[PDB]
Every structure is written in structure tokens, then in C-alpha cells.
Design a protein around this ligand. Structure first.
Ligand code: J60
Ligand code: J60
Lengths: 684, 681
């Protein structure tokens, strides 16, 4: 068991003694390096530190962060533990891996008596923390005990340090920050006031920069504290027109924040009034008195608003996005939004979809009550989908008081809109490349969504968005579920895909409503060609064994171009056994085995007689599939020879010709050669 | 210009010029188009009784709505001057008219803490327990329904709350649509005194103390998180308060108290029946160094390991990181320890993290850093670029900018090493094409986005679990507008990356960077690669398009597609009939340089040569293409079985015998009709 440590937790000294002479006193638990000696000091039991020191336990023994029970004594504050441990210590200024000494830890925990003790015993008071190189290269570390004490707001400790212990007031950390900055970050107003005063009077630089390139003055304004502002403005060397990183001056902030008194005070100390359109800002705040004051001085007449270079990307939403960028709005975290019909994209079962700006990027913002189960499902699924390239990009979510804003990539059109706009783009008898692109993206999207452990549960055309560059994206995961719990619910996504296949192949002419009321067989019968029929079938009957059946369907002839289909038929028809009509051969046994129900039964009679007619000078063309493939191959090769120019005009584009005359041909060949060596002739 | 001068005049509050213009005909119901502000609206807002009088004299409607639906009446409530309200009331149809968010003059009086105005409106029929009725979008997400009481409590207007409760019969346990009462509102006010005062009042009139605010927080929990003993005692004086209520994350008031290092409040909570099996409080106190509370917890008083990482390489450490306790920096859980370190960098290093409970790589910068700003800037614009590493977000802890990125398994370097033994020595390298086409897309799209990377190298290229390749490290990136010809450096580095990847990682990138352009070209194993690299060092003119055009280059064509193209060209009628006139042969008959297929008939095996002259093949390119076509068609016929064995795989044969052939044809037919014979790109 080796449960000594255990006993020290319970602090029962009899079991400890009993088992120092029955386990190791320097035994460190592997996770964090805690020794019983470390643990003893932490809980402040003099009896246990004594007992353990009487069994040789090293008081310079380091735990994971480099902490010795000595340094931990500084935290606990008890001076008689420090006394007990000091005689087995090489340096009193030994620091853990982040540069913390027992003295700093005394300053941090506001342990006044411990601080004095360590002062008398040689503790360095202006020691900056030396940390590991990772932390150094990002300018962390270098903080003093003064800074620690100021931050924590220990008024006691600051004063002692400054006056008794010669603490350096304008000591900087690696970020370039002095104790004054640290002081102003404390949430307690009095403590902060007290500590600022002390620090200021010893000569702390008042034009330092903290986080965000903010001065102490600006920190004070953002704190909304007249008192700290006056204290700071009593110094005459302070720069009042210093700007933070975003270019805001202390005054500007003051007006913005609706701080009449502090604004006035700032103006009466030489704060320039051309750091923003202050009147406008006061006006909008309904700060009538401050308006008047600012008007009296009239310093809102010399300031040009920036002329507006941000260029929206969306064309449909461009104009409104420009307006939204232009106007003033408060932020909800990283999100700028305004709930007005001008910026509304669409209605939803909760909250609607509005244009927004998120980290200055244009976005669609889907809104939910912050309670919402649906909002939680959406955000959950989106958070798992960031790798899925055919899912609408998720920027992030911002909660306000009572509303979950989900920010998504802005797309131009819905699938429905898009199909309508592009309905005239192909003449009736021309290949629909677009349908393939759309549907392959959806297959990938849903495939990947399933791999992610999610099922959509409401696939329909309103949930499918098209971007400026014709890319298609799946959206709306408010009804999604983790399928793991109920794996056969995936089937419903696949069914909806099946309806989407038809919807898209029909270029939006049949409504999705219509298609949802149809039975599986009605949908299949509605399919214009055999490839589509076969494809949809496989989606409505996916099989319990349906891991990644979506990905296998991307190889289906539906996704083959008409050139590739023709190319495949040609390549099969160039197999030597088809050319030599070797009926015994493997290929012909795959294609024509045994012994009329196909559109290419007696195919020679259905092709124009001249072509056939002139297609016969070499024993002849018979009505086998074999011979049709041969025919396709031969025409393929010779159609463009100059002597065949009449043939060419009768036929037109050969791929189109054969598929139209023989709609089942491509599918028939695919089926016969599917899992064979001749699969090699299929498209890429 | 006239109404504009009126409006303008009212701003300056020059009453003479207003008068002048009302009689000179100017309209006082003129609304500016942006926000709907009338001179009457504007007058009230700035509190000039003289101007509201003058304008009301001239028929100016006091029920005139601006963009949010607010009437100058409602705005008077904000101004809180009673004599404006007096002046406007005799034309008002309803005193409880609200703007589009449901705000009445009375609410606005409560909101701005305007005591005198509140009284006036009370006497004149203002409804005191009016909930805001807002538009249906806002309603469907349960916003709105707030009262003047709630407004006053939130704002912490102690005056107004008191009057409302006592004088004006305000309902204390009135709820908004979220289900919040004024108590919740009250506890959100940052000023301790005001909050204390208002809570007391509200509690004594019988405000429900078991209500839910944001985050499913009770009032009790809000008080704990505020760190305010006083507000906690007030709340715990009620005995019907549920002390073991949990917020959304399942944290109890006590738990929070221990977690936050609030000894006194923790003790008080235990002494009121707060159950001690809500978390491992001792451990928590222990870690806080809260010795006394430890002791107290010991004298008074978890397993759920189900999180599975996706990364296999990083899985075990990610499990540890998930398991341990760390404080959050916003949405980021991170621990700076060697165990969780992925790699070293120019500043901060790369560590494993959890971001919204998703595993991520975290790149660290000084929050000041120009470099960290460049990275975050470029990433924020790159979210559409599928071949750029996914950007989750950035969290600042106040001294350090944490940039969180998708965690990938391997670097390009590592990946090439792991897969170096997979292919036989001379196999076609499909993998190099995939990797490089992804990079071409990534950098192409990055340029289209206005950014250039400036430090493209194999350590900046990452491979995910599913063999996808991603560009990362935008710390030295720039908006290229600033110097457009610095794009060329990305293109050059791409050129070195082409070689690096074609050489399967065997040549170091260092090595390649020290070579001159001509040495790089000479080091290239084939003509496709040579030509491609050349075009990267000597680019065209289209920034975010050249790269996309180069995806059509024969380097990216499979060996089958190359062979297919040469066959299809060689089946053009004019090549077969040897029509020297013809357009195709004119395009193929260029001064020139010595090509490896000059007198090609002499260096193709003599048996094949003879068998193929099946009765005159000349040393033209035309005739070579014809040869390729014919062999293509007949190679598998049974009578050619000896030919087949000599040749082996025909694509490989021709490219190896004639390394410049594919390139030569590409170049001759590039921008012609016969481009149609190229593979679909
Ligand atoms: C075109 C008129 N028609 C009414 C019969 C449809 C009204 N518009 C929409 O339905 C609509 C449109 C045009 N776009 C959208 C949704 C968008 C949208 O347009 N962009 C977008 C980005 C992300 C998310 Cl989640 C949702 C969207 C919606 C819901
Ligand atoms: C095998 C030792 N060798 C260096 C001595 C390589 C060790 N690892 C890496 O170099 C490395 C690895 C495994 N991953 C990364 C970088 C990653 C990384 O793995 N994910 C990731 C996300 C975003 C960004 Cl900006 C950078 C990265 C790096 C730099």
C-alpha cells in the first residue's frame, strides 16, 4: 500500500510515526511531485514537519513546479516553519520553475510576519522572476514582490516593502509593466486607491503601458473611478492624450462610457476634444449635460471620420454589410449585429438569421434563446464539424445576457434560389455537370458528418447553401443528434439524400414538399435516367451494413462525365476478345452469358442505316452487346477521319448519341463488370 | 437644405433661426432617413423647453415615431424633465405607447433614474407592471417582457425601486419572458451598496429566490460568484431557498465558493445544509492553499472518464490534460509543461490544448507581438481556405496571445519519412501530386485573400490523420498589397517544395535553399518537374490565378492521362494521313533544340519497329504520336504478345525513352484547339 502520505492528509501523527519506522519520507507521488513534507507545510502542522524532519526528509526537495517545502512555507506564512526549515537551505532566494521565491509567495499571500523574517535573513526584495525559456520568449515573468502585493491589493505589504525594505517602485517586468499597472487591475476600489497613492508618491512612472497598450489613466477611466483619475491627473508629467492600441484616448473612452464628471475633469486638464466625435457620442448616450459642456468648448468640429475602405465580399449582401460596418453598434464579444429588417437574411423557428460582423468578417448569425436545447445541439455539432469542408464554416458563438448568437459563413443563395437563377443555363439536351458537383459535395458533407458521430435529421433544400464560388455547404444542425446512441437513424439522412438527388436532377422543377409526399417507388419512377434511378435506389436501400456507403457511391456512373462513360464503353470494346468475337472468353461470359429485355437487343436496327450502312466495310456486326461495344470502339476511333464526315453529322456528339439511343447501356456494363478485373476500364 | 438648416439649427439650439425657418415654411415632422430623428425628438433629447414649445406651436406631432418606434414623448421619460412631459401629454393618445422593443416613457424614466418624471407619469395613468411587448423575432427567443422594476434594479437606482415598490404598487415577482425577476437583475449590478439595498427591498416584498437567470444560475450562485458575504446572508435568511440548486454546468453554490477561495461563505453555506457531495471540496481547498477551509471541510466531509481524443499520436497526453484541473483562459484549457509540448518556436512554443472541449494545437505569442497580430489577422481571413489549418480562435490571458489551431498528426517532413519505404523505387508518385496540388490551392487561395505567407517550408506544412495537407504558421505573413512583388518569394519557396516532395524528403530543405536556380533545375528528376519549377521562378502576371492555372500542367497528370493524351493527339486524321499542310502538324513542326525524339525510330527496339511497320514510320513527331496511338490500340491483341513483353507498361516506356515528349507536346498545343486532348483538369 505505501500509504504514508495518506496519513499526513488525515494529520494523525501516531500512524505517521508508526510508519516512519515500519515507507520513504522523500517519496514523491508521480502526478505532481507532492512529498509528505511538502504536504505537511501546506496544511500547517508544526508537529508533522518536526516528525518528518526527524527522519531525514530534505526541505530542498522539489515537486513538479520546482517548489520546495521552504517556498511553500512563505505561502502558509507561519514563521516557525520557516525557522525550522532555514538551517537546511543553501539559498533563501531559491525559486520554483516560474521564478517564485518564498518571499514573493509571502508577498502574494499577504503574510506580513513571514515577509519581515525573510527580509532580515537576506531575501532579495527587487528580485524579478526568472522563468523557463518558453515563457521568456513571450515576455512573461520578471515580476517582483511589490507587483504581486499591488495586484493582490495587500495594502499592508506594499507599504512595508516601499518604506522598510527599500523596494524599487519603478521596477518593470518583462512585459514593461510596473506595480502601478498591477495595482489598477485589482477589483477593490479602496485598496487600489491606497496602493496607487503610495506608488505614485515614491515616483512610479505614470506613462507606462499595460495590456492593450493602455496607460494607467485609461485603466482608471475604464474602471469608472473618478478618484483614481484625479490621483493620476495630480501628476503634471502624465500624458493625457496617450492612445490605447485601438487608438482611443482616455477622454474618448470617458464620453463613450457615459462618464460626465470624468469627461469634464479630463477636458479641464488639456484633453484634446478631436480624438473622436464626442458630441455625437454624448448625444447618442442621451447625456444632455455633457453634450452642452462639449458644445461650449466646440471641439467636435475638427475631426474627420475615416472614409471607409472595408470591402464586403458578398455581392447580394454587400450594400447592407457596408451600412452595418458604417453604423455604430455595441459589441457582443466579437460580434457586431443590429436587429433590423434591413439586415435580415431569413426567418427561423427561433430568432431569425441576420447579417453580422465577427472579428470584422461578414457572417450570417443564427439566433437562439440562450437556454435552447436546439441552440445547444447546433453549436455542439458545428464545434465537431470544423474539418468538414462541405459544412458551412463556423466562426464562433457569442452569448449576450439572454441570446445565443451562432456565427456562420455568409452564403449568397439557398439551393432552391440557386437552381432557379441557373435554370436556363443548359439547353434541354445537354449534360448537367452542376448536379453532379452539388450532389457529390452533399455526399461528402453527410459522409463526414456521420464520421464525426452526427446525423442531420432534417436534410432539405432550404438547409443547403451556395457560396459566391458555386460551392455547396450543408447548414442547420439544430435538429442533429449523435447517432452512436441509435445507429439506424442515419438511414433517414440517406433517404433525404435520395430525395435531394431527384430534386437537383430535376433542376428544382419538382418541389421538395411534393417529393416528401411520394413513396420510394414514386420517386424512383420520377427519375429521368437509369443512372439516377439506380443511385436513388441505393440511397433508399442502403443496408444495415452502411458504414461508408456514401463514399462508395461517388464511384457510381451517375458521377461519371459523358466523356468518361463513352471512354469506358470504347475501352471495353477494344478488348481483343470482343474484337475477335471469342464467345468462350472471360469478358464475353461476363457480358453475354446464357440467353432481349434491354434497349440494345437488336441494336443494329435502331441505328441510322447509312452509318450502319457505311459502318460495315470491315465477319459482320451482330446484335450482341459485345458487338455494340466493338461498334462504339470503332466509331470512336474513326469518326473524325475525313472520309467519315457524313457519319459525323448524322450522329452528332457520339457519347450523347449512344446514351440516348440506349439508356440502359452504361448501367448494364457497370453492373456486369463492377467487381471484376475489367473494373480497370471505369472512370477515375 | 432648408429642413437640413432647421435640423442643424436645433442642434446649436439657436431659437431665432428655428422660428425664422418655421415661418419660412420648414417642416417640423421632417425625419432624417438614417434613424428617423425629428427636430421635435432632437429638442426633447437635449432638454430645451423653449424649442419643444416653439415646435409644438407649429403642428409638430408628438406621437411621431423614429426608427426604433420611439415618440418624443417616450424620449421625455429619458430626459426626465417634467415640463416637457406636461407640454407633450395633451396631444398623446396613449401614455403607455411603446417603441418597437416595448419601452414606454415610464420604463425610460425608470431606466434613467428620473424620479420626478416617474411620479408625474404615475399620476397620469402610466401602467407600472407593463411588460415590454417586442417584435416576434425577439419574442420567439424569449427576449422582452421586462418591467420598470427590473430596469430600475439592474441600473441600481435605489431611489426609483423604493418608490415603485411602496408608492406605485409595483409587482415584485413579475417575470420577463426568460423567467427572470427583478432579484436576478438586481444581483447583476456591479455596485455593492446599491445591489445590497435593492436586494433587501425586493426580498422583503417577497421576490422568489429560486429563479433562474443567464446560465441557469440562481440568485444564490450569482451572489457567490460576486464574492459578497452580505448578499449571501440576505439570501440565506429565506429557508425555502434551495441551496443545492445547480447551474448549467452542474456546479452548486458551495462548490463555487470553495473553488473561488471564499472561506467564510463556504462555512456559512455548510452551516445551512449545503451538501458536500457536489464536488471534491477538500482537494479544491487544498489546491487553493486554503488550510483552514480544508480542516473545516474535513470535519464536515466523482468518476466520469468518458472523453476520447481523436488524435492517436497525441491521444494519451490529451487524456491526461482533460483529466487534470486547470483554470480556463476563456474557452482554452492549457498547461505549460513538457508533457504537453508539441514543438518549439521563435516565441512561445506549440502546446496541446482543449478549446470548447475540442483538442487543438496552441501557438503562443506575447500579447503585444506584431507577429501574433499578423498570424491572427491572416487566420481570421482564411476560414474558407480548406487547405489552411483550421482556426478555432484566440484567447488572451492579458500577457499572452493564445492562437488555437486544429491539431494535426505530422509535419510534412515526418510524414514523408513515415511513408518513405512504401513505394518500390521507380513507382509513379501519386502522393507527391496530392500533397503539392493541395499546397497550390492553399497558397493560391491565400493570395486571392490578399495574404502572402513569406516563410513557406516543410515544417510549416501539416498532415492530418486522413492524409490531408494543410498550410500553417502565418506569423511572418503580410498583406501583399504592401509589396506585390514579394508574392514571388512564396512562388520560389513553392518551387523548392516541389523538389523537396518529389525527392520524397531525401534532400533537406536547407540544402535546397543553398542551391542556385540552375542547381535546383538540374536536381529535378524529370522534365515536368523542371518545367513546373521554372514557371514558379519566372511567373506570369495573375497573383491569385497563376497557381490555379498551373494545376493544369502535365506534372499533375497521371502517367495514364499522359499516355492517353499522346494517343488521342496521334489519332488526329492529319497525323494519320501525314498531311504536312495541316494545322496540327504546323503546330508540331517548329528554330528549335535537340529533342530526344529526333530520329526516334532508331532507339526503339528493332523487333517492335519492324512488327509495327505492318504492310513507313518516319522520324517526325507526328509519326511518333501515330506510333503511340497504334500501339495503344493493338498492344493487347494476341498476335502482339512479344511486342508487349519487350515494352512493358507502354506509358512508362515512352516517357522513359523520350523524357521531353509530354512537355514538348503540351507546349506546342497549349493554347490551341487541340488543348481538348489534354486530361480534364
Ligand atoms: C428569395 C425569397 N425566398 C422567399 C420565397 C427565400 C427567402 N430567403 C431565405 O430563405 C434564405 C436565403 C435567401 N438565404 C437563407 C439562409 C442563408 C443565407 O442566405 N446565407 C446563409 C448563411 C448561413 C446560414 Cl445558416 C443561412 C444562410 C435563407 C434562410
Ligand atoms: C521530430 C522532431 N522534429 C523537430 C525537432 C519535429 C517535431 N515536431 C514539429 O516540428 C511539429 C509538429 C509535430 N507539429 C508542429 C506544428 C504544428 C502541429 O503539429 N499542429 C500545428 C498547428 C498549428 C501550427 Cl501554426 C503548427 C502546428 C510542429 C512545428
Amino acid at each position: 500500500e505505501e500509504m504514508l502520505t495518506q496519513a499526513v492528509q488525515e494529520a494523525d501523527i501516531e500512524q505517521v510515526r508508526q510508519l516512519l519506522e515500519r515507507a520513504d519520507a522523500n517519496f514523491q507521488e508521480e502526478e505532481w511531485g507532492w512529498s509528505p513534507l511538502h504536504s505537511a507545510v501546506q496544511m500547517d502542522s508544526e508537529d508533522l514537519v518536526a516528525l518528518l524532519l526527524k527522519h531525514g526528509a530534505d526541505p530542498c526537495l522539489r515537486k513538479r513546479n520546482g517548489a520546495t517545502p521552504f517556498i511553500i512555507a512563505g505561502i502558509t506564512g507561519n514563521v516557525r516553519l520557516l525557522q525550522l526549515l532555514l538551517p537546511n537551505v543553501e539559498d533563501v532566494n531559491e525559486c520554483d520553475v516560474n521564478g517564485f521565491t518564498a518571499f514573493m509567495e509571502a508577498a502574494v499571500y499577504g503574510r506580513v510576519e513571514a515577509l519581515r523574517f525573510l527580509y532580515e535573513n537576506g531575501a532579495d526584495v527587487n528580485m524579478h522572476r526568472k522563468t523557463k525559456q518558453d515563457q521568456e520568449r513571450i515576455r512573461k515573468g520578471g515580476a517582483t514582490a511589490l507587483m504581486d502585493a499591488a495586484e493582490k491589493g495587500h495594502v499592508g505589504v506594499v507599504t512595508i516593502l516601499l518604506h522598510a525594505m527599500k523596494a524599487e517602485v519603478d521596477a518593470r517586468d518583462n512585459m514593461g509593466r510596473n506595480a502601478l499597472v498591477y495595482a489598477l487591475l485589482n477589483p477593490d476600489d479602496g485598496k487600489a486607491k491606497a496602493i496607487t497613492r503610495l506608488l505614485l508618491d515614491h515616483g512610479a512612472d505614470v506613462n507606462v503601458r499595460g495590456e492593450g497598450s493602455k496607460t494607467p489613466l485609461i485603466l482608471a477611466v475604464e474602471r469608472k473611478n473618478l478618484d483614481l483619475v484625479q490621483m493620476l491627473l495630480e501628476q503634471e508629467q502624465i500624458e493625457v492624450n496617450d492612445t490605447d492600441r485601438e487608438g482611443k484616448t482616455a477622454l474618448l473612452l470617458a464620453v463613450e462610457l457615459r462618464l460626465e464628471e470624468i469627461a469634464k475633469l479630463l477636458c479641464h486638464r488639456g484633453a484634446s476634444t478631436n480624438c473622436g466625435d464626442l458630441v455625437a457620442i454624448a448625444r447618442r448616450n442621451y447625456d444632455s449635460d455633457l453634450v452642452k459642456f462639449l458644445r461650449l468648448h466646440k471641439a467636435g468640429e475638427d475631426f474627420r471620420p475615416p472614409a471607409e475602405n472595408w470591402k464586403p465580399q458578398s455581392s447580394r449582401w454587400g450594400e447592407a454589410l457596408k451600412h452595418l460596418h458604417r453604423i455604430w453598434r455595441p459589441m457582443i464579444g466579437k460580434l457586431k449585429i443590429f436587429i433590423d429588417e434591413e439586415y435580415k437574411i431569413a426567418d427561423t423557428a427561433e430568432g431569425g438569421i441576420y447579417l453580422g460582423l465577427y472579428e470584422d468578417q461578414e457572417v450570417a448569425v443564427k439566433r437562439f434563446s440562450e437556454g435552447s436545447t436546439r441552440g445547444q445541439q447546433e453549436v455542439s455539432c458545428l464545434q465537431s464539424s470544423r474539418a468538414n469542408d462541405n459544412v458551412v464554416t463556423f466562426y464562433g458563438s457569442e452569448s449576450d445576457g439572454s441570446c445565443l448568437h451562432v456565427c456562420l459563413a455568409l452564403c449568397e443563395y439557398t439551393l432552391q434560389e440557386h437552381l432557379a437563377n441557373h435554370r436556363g443555363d443548359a439547353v434541354p439536351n445537354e449534360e448537367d455537370e452542376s448536379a453532379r458537383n452539388i450532389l457529390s459535395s452533399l455526399f461528402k458533407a453527410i459522409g463526414e458528418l456521420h464520421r464525426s458521430g452526427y446525423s442531420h435529421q432534417d436534410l432539405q433544400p432550404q438547409n443547403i447553401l451556395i457560396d459566391s464560388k458555386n460551392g455547396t455547404f450543408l447548414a442547420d444542425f439544430d435538429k442533429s443528434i449523435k447517432w452512436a446512441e441509435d445507429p439506424q437513424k442515419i438511414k433517414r439522412d440517406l433517404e433525404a439524400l435520395g430525395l435531394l438527388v431527384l430534386y437537383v436532377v430535376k433542376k428544382g422543377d419538382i418541389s421538395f414538399e411534393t417529393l416528401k409526399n411520394q413513396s420510394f417507388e414514386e420517386v424512383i419512377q420520377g427519375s429521368p435516367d437509369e443512372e439516377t434511378r439506380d443511385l436513388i435506389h441505393h440511397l433508399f436501400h442502403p443496408g444495415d451494413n452502411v458504414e461508408d456507403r456514401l463514399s462508395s457511391l461517388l464511384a457510381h456512373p451517375f458521377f461519371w462525365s459523358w466523356e468518361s462513360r463513352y471512354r469506358t464503353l470504347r475501352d471495353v470494346g477494344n478488348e481483343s476478345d470482343i474484337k475477335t468475337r471469342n464467345q468462350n472468353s472471360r469478358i464475353l461470359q461476363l457480358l453475354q452469358p446464357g440467353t432481349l429485355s434491354t434497349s440494345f437487343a437488336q441494336w443494329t436496327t435502331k441505328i441510322d442505316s447509312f452509318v450502319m450502312e457505311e459502318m460495315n466495310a470491315y465477319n459482320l456486326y451482330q446484335d450482341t452487346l459485345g458487338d455494340l461495344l466493338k461498334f462504339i470502339r470503332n466509331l470512336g476511333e474513326h469518326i473524325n477521319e475525313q472520309k467519315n464526315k457524313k457519319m459525323k453529322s448524322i450522329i452528332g456528339e457520339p457519347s450523347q448519341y449512344f446514351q440516348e439511343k440506349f439508356p440502359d447501356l452504361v448501367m448494364y456494363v457497370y453492373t456486369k463488370l463492377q467487381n471484376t478485373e475489367y473494373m480497370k476500364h471505369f472512370p477515375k
